[PDB]
Symmetry: C3
Subunit: 77 residues, 3 copies
């Protein structure tokens, strides 16, 4: 029903930014609420169609620790 | 009561970014929740006063299809 | 229980952007929903851990009036 899950680290298929899925909106694919670090590194709330997202393989990002921190935190909230 | 409507394509009166109104907050004008593509092209959730927004005339944006996609989708959700 | 309050002007401890706390998420410190102006000056919704935030001293920002406007408005909504 949903390709990506809440708390999963994802990347923008086009721009390649790192982010975390924080919510999903149903009703052909669903939209995703994802907190995503931009150019500067601001954890910015974005609204992205499922086709704009790709799974992030790595679980550790030393350059972007806050996104690892976010993913772990959300996976419990 | 509200100058702009949910699902309407708008532009930032100053910066000129393209966006879509996704929600409105009442109580002199109201604030708008609008998903708006920035420099890089991230559909970023912004919070803007009514005075910062202008109607977008065009209904078709080949350079920014996701904003057209967003507007149509929201106009049904 | 919470270091920063809703409606308080804050700065990103690292990047130094100006923003306003619009909501707080509990359950070791809490996360903050803060509307924050980026490079271009977009009032962007960001999600920040308490450790990423610092109190903003000044109450008047002539270069960024909308953040002063936001703070005052939210302190009543």
């Amino acid at each position: 029903a949903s390709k990506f899950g809440i708390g999963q680290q994802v990347r923008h298929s086009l721009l390649g930014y790192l982010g975390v899925v924080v919510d999903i909106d149903p009703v052909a694919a669903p939209w995703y609420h994802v907190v995503m670090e931009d150019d500067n590194g601001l954890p910015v709330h974005t609204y992205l169609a499922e086709a704009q997202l790709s799974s992030e393989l790595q679980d550790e990002h030393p350059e972007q620790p806050s996104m690892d921190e976010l993913a772990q935190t959300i996976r419990k909230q």
